[PDB]
Structures are given as structure tokens and as C-alpha cells.
């Protein structure tokens, strides 16, 4: 739908993955929770020859001009302006690609209690081997490392592109 372009500036010797995973999303989660989770993020810089790549360009997707007008990222985010650059050029574009959230974490002792409690079966050769393979394919993907709030720990979030151009969003800006 409606898109806003936001750019980063290479040349400082540091890749901006830390600056988009720590100085963008932990400070945007509060306004995502406040504003009923009606915004998304995307990038037209896919490069999956061997590893995951992000490029240097981010776009914020909203379904109406009022949301992008009332976001006003140029002024409230005036702390990392030496690295990020804002564009007050919100309009409608027909070249938007949507993104969904896919999550698959390790499940040995997270659900060992559930497997000894709810349903028990022999997990020696076939099934436990199914865990790490399920933790391998999604592993070979462009990830984002964020921080929790309840119990302090970091983890991996994988953002997969999709063809579903319409729908609702979540706290991470995905679905």
C-alpha cells in the first residue's frame, strides 16, 4: 500500500544491521503496540546467492496517508541522524513486497517437560534428529537479533518474503 522510504549511510566501517536491530525496532515496538500494530517493513535488496543479505534501504508500509503523516519519524528519531536519513515524501506506490514472520527455535528442554507430560514416545533416532534439521534450513536465512523485555535474553527472528500483499500486522510489523 502506502510506503515511506528511509535510508542508511554506508562508509562508516560498520554494517547497519545492529543499528536497525537495536536503534529501530526496540524503539518502534512501543509505538507499534500503542498504534494497534498497523505498520510493516520491507526492503527491495534481496540477495540470497550463498547467505542472507539486507542491502541498505528500508521502507515502512501503511494502509493510509494519515498513519504515515502522523508517524513523523524525521523528528522523534533525532538521535542517530549521523547514520540514518529520513524522507518526507510519502505517497502511493505499486511496487510493494510484503513480509511475514517465521520462527523456529530449539526445543529440547523447552518442551522436554511437555513431551514427558502430554505425550511420550521414543525419540532416539528419528524424532530428535528432526529438531536440528528444523533448526537448520531456517537457520540459513537473513536474521534479525532483538532483545526481550520480560526475561532478558537475545534471540533470532527470521523474516520471510511473501505474496500476500494485504492483511493485518503484528507487534513485529509482520504476520
Amino acid at each position: 500500500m502506502f510506503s515511506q522510504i528511509l535510508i542508511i549511510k554506508p562508509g562508516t566501517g560498520i554494517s547497519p544491521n545492529i543499528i536497525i536491530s537495536e536503534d529501530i525496532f526496540p524503539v518502534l515496538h512501543s509505538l507499534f503496540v500503542e498504534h494497534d500494530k498497523k505498520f510493516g517493513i520491507t526492503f527491495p535488496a534481496y540477495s540470497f546467492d550463498k547467505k542472507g543479505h539486507l542491502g541498505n534501504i528500508i521502507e515502512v508500509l501503511s494502509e493510509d496517508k494519515e498513519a504515515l503523516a502522523s508517524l513523523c519519524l524525521e523528528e522523534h528519531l533525532a538521535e542517530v541522524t549521523d547514520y540514518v536519513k529520513v524522507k518526507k515524501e510519502i505517497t502511493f506506490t505499486d511496487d510493494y513486497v510484503l513480509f511475514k514472520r517465521i520462527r523456529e527455535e530449539n526445543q529440547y528442554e523447552t518442551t522436554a517437560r511437555r513431551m514427558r507430560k502430554r505425550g511420550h514416545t521414543e525419540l532416539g533416532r528419528p524424532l530428535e534428529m528432526h529438531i536440528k534439521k528444523k533448526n537448520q534450513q531456517i537457520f540459513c536465512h537473513a536474521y534479525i537479533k532483538v532483545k526481550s523485555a520480560s526475561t532478558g535474553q537475545s534471540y533470532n527472528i527470521f523474516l520471510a518474503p511473501t505474496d500476500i500483499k494485504h492483511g493485518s500486522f503484528s507487534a513485529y510489523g509482520l504476520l
Binding site: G11, I14, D23, D82, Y83
Partner: protein
């Protein structure tokens, strides 16, 4: 076999743990925890990380090291004399003043931090406190209170009025408490430990001063297609950067053809071009012509 030498000599930065209010006193060493990947962090008491390094300034034509031709030395001396009688080596000194002033040397410690303060002291005099957040990154502010007083001594030491200059720079970030700050690693020396090592000298951490040198060397805004990219670039032989991936001067604006048309042709190149050639002369290095191979 023309080759200059550095007119800006760097000393290795050292990390010292420091509490909040007593920044001047109570400096403690910073040891590195070897974890299985060397890394370290600040403790629950000290919440200020100090950087101490030195810059030695020696004049440019006295920094000339190797030449197999007297006429090249005479032409270089004439060009330097014309630059002294034309500009006076003040703008490059002002740019190094701005680059040491804005605390651009910490690199990764700058992001995520607000309270960064540096103090630049001459051998007998110091300077007041600094607000290094207030400066920008892609500009060069050339009109302040004490900028002329701090830049004139460096300009005269570059020119030849003062034979020596010694600069002690001590800077510190203060806002974070029990956070982590990692020095530049010691490369892949021995692969017995596959993890990332850190910098260790004199029983502490610190910073490689090649990092500080390439921090202060990033003032070049005279490259071709400046309006397309719009940031300073370190003053290198080709102006190349390994981050963006595009060499900025693969053309006649690069140093080889520039100095060929400056010396072997005696061209009247404009002010920014001769600014670039005196910046790369200040940086120093192996400037010899290519042997016939």
C-alpha cells in the same frame, strides 16, 4: 623512489576503567575475560571508559624521506612555498581540529552513547570541556571560539615556524553503566583459539591507533561525483573504500596522474585539488612510481 613520511605520528590508545564523577583520578586497568571468544564489559562500579593517545606533529618538507632526483625535491619545495604564500596550511589543520574535536575516533563506541567528552592538551596548556555530540559528521565547522587558537599551532608546525608539536588527547564516554566496549582485535595471529581475540598491551585493553589515524584522515570531500554519495572519505592513494565497494578515484583525479600533471606539466590545478594533494602529502607513504615489470 619518492617517499614521504608521516607528519602526524600516532600513539596507541589505552582503555582505563573510570567511575562517574572522578574522571581525572582513580584510573584502573582493563583486563580481558577469556570466554569460550574473548570479550569484556564494564563492572557495576565504574561507568566511564577512557582513551589516551598522542599525536606528534613535524613539518612536511622536513618529513621528506626518499628521492633519487634533486629537481623533484626542488619542485616539491616550490609547490609547498607557493601553498604557504597562497593558503598557509590552515584549512587542513582546521579539518584535523574538527575530526579530533567531534570525537570521531571511538567508532563503535559513538553509537548508542550520548555523553562523549574530549580534552586536547598541548605540552604546557590544556583546553576546556567539549560537547562532541553537537558537531555533525559530513560537515566541517570552521567558525568557533577557540578553533583558530588550536589550529594555528598545528598550521605553523606543518609550515615550519614550530619544529615540534605534541598533542595528548584523552576522551571518555560516560552515559552507559555496566555496558561493554570492545577494542580492535589482534587479527588471526594463532588459530589455537578460534574465538575473537582483543587488544592487550601494558596490562590493559585499548585501541589500535591505525583506527584513530583512519578516523582523523577522513576529511576528503573533493572526490568526483561528490553530490551522489555526500560523505567524507579517508585520504588514500586511490581514495578507495572497502565498505561501499566502489573506488572513488579510478580516474585522472587519482593521485598518480594528479601529481604527474602537477609536477611534470606544471598545471594550475584548482584549490580543492591542491588541497587533496597536500592532504595526501601530509598522510605520507610510499609514493614511488611503478617499476617497469
Amino acid at each position: 623512489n619518492l617517499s614521504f613520511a608521516r607528519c602526524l605520528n600516532t600513539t596507541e590508545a589505552k582503555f582505563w576503567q573510570t567511575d562517574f564523577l572522578k574522571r581525572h583520578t582513580f584510573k584502573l586497568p582493563l583486563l580481558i575475560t577469556d570466554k569460550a571468544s574473548q570479550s569484556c564489559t564494564l563492572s557495576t562500579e565504574c561507568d566511564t571508559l577512557r582513551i589516551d593517545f598522542g599525536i606528534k606533529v613535524l613539518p612536511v618538507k622536513e618529513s621528506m624521506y626518499s628521492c633519487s632526483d634533486y629537481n623533484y625535491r626542488t619542485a616539491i619545495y616550490q609547490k609547498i612555498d607557493e601553498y604557504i604564500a597562497e593558503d598557509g596550511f590552515l584549512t587542513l589543520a582546521k579539518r584535523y581540529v574538527n575530526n579530533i574535536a567531534n570525537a570521531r575516533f571511538l567508532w563503535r563506541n559513538r553509537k548508542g552513547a550520548e555523553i562523549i567528552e574530549t580534552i586536547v592538551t598541548i605540552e604546557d596548556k590544556e583546553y576546556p570541556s567539549f560537547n562532541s555530540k553537537s558537531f555533525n559528521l559530513d560537515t566541517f565547522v570552521e567558525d568557533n571560539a577557540t578553533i583558530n587558537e588550536i589550529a594555528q599551532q598545528i598550521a605553523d608546525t606543518f609550515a615550519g615556524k614550530r619544529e615540534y608539536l605534541n598533542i595528548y588527547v584523552t576522551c571518555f564516554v560516560k552515559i552507559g553503566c555496566a555496558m561493554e566496549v570492545y577494542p580492535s582485535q589482534e587479527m588471526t595471529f594463532d588459530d589455537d583459539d578460534k574465538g575473537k581475540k582483543l587488544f592487550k598491551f601494558e596490562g590493559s585493553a585499548g585501541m589500535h591507533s591505525q583506527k584513530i589515524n583512519n578516523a582523523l584522515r577522513t576529511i576528503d570531500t573533493w572526490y568526483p561525483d561528490y553530490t551522489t554519495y555526500e560523505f567524507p572519505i579517508p585520504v588514500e592513494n586511490y581514495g578507495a573504500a572497502r565498505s561501499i565497494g566502489i573506488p572513488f578515484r579510478p580516474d585522472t583525479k587519482s593521485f598518480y596522474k594528479l601529481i604527474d600533471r602537477m609536477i611534470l606539466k606544471n598545471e594550475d590545478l584548482p584549490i580543492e585539488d591542491k588541497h587533496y594533494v597536500m592532504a595526501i602529502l601530509i598522510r605520507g607513504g610510499m609514493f614511488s612510481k611503478k617499476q617497469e615489470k
